[model samples]
Target: LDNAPLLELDVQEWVNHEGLSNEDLRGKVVVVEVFQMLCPGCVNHGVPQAQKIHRMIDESQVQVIGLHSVFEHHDVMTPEALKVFIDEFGIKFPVAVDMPREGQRIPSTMKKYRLEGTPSIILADRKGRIRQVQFGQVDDFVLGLLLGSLLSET
Candidate 1:
């Protein structure tokens, strides 16, 4: 999908910032990791990976975001619980709670992005176009290379 636009984040609440949108992140390389707080892969790999990217990159050029897309165990993964989870996990980057659809388990953003499950990684360029989408654990070295290439682009 060439020049595919980045989908707007359908979130109910923002944990760290007042609010953020794809338009707000234009002219920067955006890294979005879609995850569920209760998922082991998300806790073990996804969140840490996003944290690393946030720590290593210059904020002026890159924006790392976490999307808490809970498709199951909705009761336990409330925004209140997620605030505690973010605090405990040391997630400093802005994290958004995926908006729940009426009479549906899958959140709006996850459904919009067509994410298979938790721990999905999405990379978008400065032009606000999606460049890559990975469903599971993404290799750190490869991810670095991809980010570097995007950052170097005009």
Candidate 2:
């Protein structure tokens, strides 16, 4: 499939904060971040970069949502667990626990997006079509693409 079904999370295994739907996110562009709370490097490095992206996106026109796919603390993958991460890290973007039917939702998204590592981001356009992708710790390529030239009308 060239694209997934907008893949809005059923997210039954965990909670969905911002309770915002894919439809609600329609008009504006989107950035979906797939990560694990257990990743020290990601938590230390990627989160700060995400903060910058979130700030730069200007929520009205662009929105970023975080998908916390836990590996270490499976039991702690509850809303309470998420609360701790958000409180400790001060994540300002919407975060949802991703759980797919066949496998873990985060992993599914990773594979679907062909991400080889954590701290992966899928940047999509207003049409819900993934426009660009980034992986590993955030880098200038990701930032530049995010803030760079607009996609041509063609």
Candidate 3:
């Protein structure tokens, strides 16, 4: 299937790195995990899965990123809390807080991607085309295969 170019992320703050842009991600495969801290699925499944990918993938070729797209419980899931969570969770990959829009519940990056909810995954190939967008739990074996295939491509 034909894929679209990766979209720019609207970020409020970044953790584990100064910042990252689409331009910086050029010529690299990217795995963006869209998650909310308060969400059970994200904490138990999505975040850990991302951590695994971050550990397994080669940093030179693959970039793993977390998008803290807080759709609810805004007061609790502040940037400070996110930092603590990241440190506690041992998340090494760069994570960015999705920018909050004025009078909107869904954050900018989440809305831009039209994600249904938290625990969403966006995989972009080396050429920066979005190869897949998945919601909820994705099988590790399946994810590995997808990543392998993408990495094999020119």
Candidate 4:
């Protein structure tokens, strides 16, 4: 069911370990960063990109959720490791890891989200229409520029 591009994620019914949902994901713009926690690029580019996006929308009514699509990153991708990653990288936003990998109701949410690379972002408005989608190589400056434009629109 590839409906309209996502403006925002509706997590009200979808529950993760974080207990987040489209409802919890509402009230503001959402920047969903999908990544594999163990991927070097994710640690390097993805996490930082999410942080930068969060900073851009800190005051503007936006929330960032780093969706760690843990595939092969499971080696050190424990909750403790995730916490460490956040602390070390100064990540303030919350993250949901490997929902697609967990093999529950949906077989794979990765393809649906268009997560082809280690670092990918899906930006949506409050209504859940996909406003922006970026994959591969998320950098501080680039994320800054891209998210800045998104913030301006909504």
Cα lDDT of all candidates, in order? 0.89, 0.66, 0.89, 0.63
Worst 10 residues of 2 by lDDT: 145-154
Q: How many residue pairs clash in each candidate?
A: 0, 1, 0, 16
Clashing pairs in 3: none
Worst 10 residues of 4 by lDDT: 8-17
TM-score of each: 0.95, 0.75, 0.94, 0.70
Cα lDDT tens digits, model 2, 1-154, are 2654454444434344547777887767777777777676678777777777788767777777887765445665665777788888888787876654354544455555566667777776666666666777667575656645433222
Query: Poorest 10 consecutive residues of model 3 by lDDT?
Result: 1-10
What tens digits encode model 4's per-residue C-alpha lDDT throughout 1-154?
1576654332322212355566666656777887666777788777776776677667347778766655553557665677666667777777665444344422144556655666778877666567677778766677666666655663
Runs in model 1 lying further than 4 Å from the true structure: 1-3
lDDT of candidate model 3 versus the reference: 0.89
Error of 4 at 114 (Å): 3.4
- Cα lDDT tens digits, model 1, 1-154, are 5648665778888987878766789899999999999898999998999999899887899999999999999889898999999999899999998899999999998898889998998888998888888998888998999999999997
Candidate 3, residue 52: the lDDT equals 90
What is the per-residue lDDT of model 3 for residues 19-129, given as tens digits with 9 covering 90 to 100? Answer: 977788888889999998879999999999999988887888899999999989899999999999999999999999999999988999888889999899999987677
lDDT ranking from best to worst? 3, 1, 2, 4
- What pairs collide in candidate 1? none
